[PDB]
Structure 1
Amino acid sequence: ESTSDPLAALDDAISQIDKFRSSLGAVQNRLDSAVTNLNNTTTNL
């Protein structure tokens, strides 16, 4: 029994993967901003 809507399901899976990647890249940038904060504040301290 073939899938009823193959292409739609594939598109939804790809969208889910891309959403996870976007959420993960956001936290990448977030941690890097934290790293910049850390050295900047430790030099002043």
Structure 2
Amino acid sequence: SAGSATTNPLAALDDAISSIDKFRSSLGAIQNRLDSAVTNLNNTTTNLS
């Protein structure tokens, strides 16, 4: 006669935290590559000038 309390609260919270961390890591990688793109654009602009 299973009740209504959540079965594995710690496991569920771990899954949620893992999802948040994964998405933050993806954003960080995107930002790093975007900064690299900015630097390359500045160098190319200088050389074209």
In structure 2, the gaps of 5 or more residues are none
Q: CA deviation at 1:26?
A: 0.1
Q: Comparing both structures, which one devotes a greater share of its residues to helix?
A: 1
Q: TM-score, normalised by structure 2?
A: 0.89
Runs of 5+ unmatched residues, structure 1: none
- Tell me by how many angstroms 1:31 deviates: 0.3
Instruction: Indicate whether 1:26 and 2:33 are aligned.
Output: no
After superposition, residues 1-45 of structure 1 pair within 5 angstroms as: 1-45=4-48
Q: Which has the larger radius of gyration?
A: 2
Two-structure CA RMSD over aligned residues (Å): 0.4
Identity of aligned residues (%): 87
Q: Which whole-Å CA distance do the structure 2 matches of 1:28 and 1:39 have between them?
A: 17
1:1-45 Cα shifts (integer Å, max 9, x gaps): 110000000000000000000001000000000000000010000
The two structures have a TM-score, normalised by structure 1, of 0.97
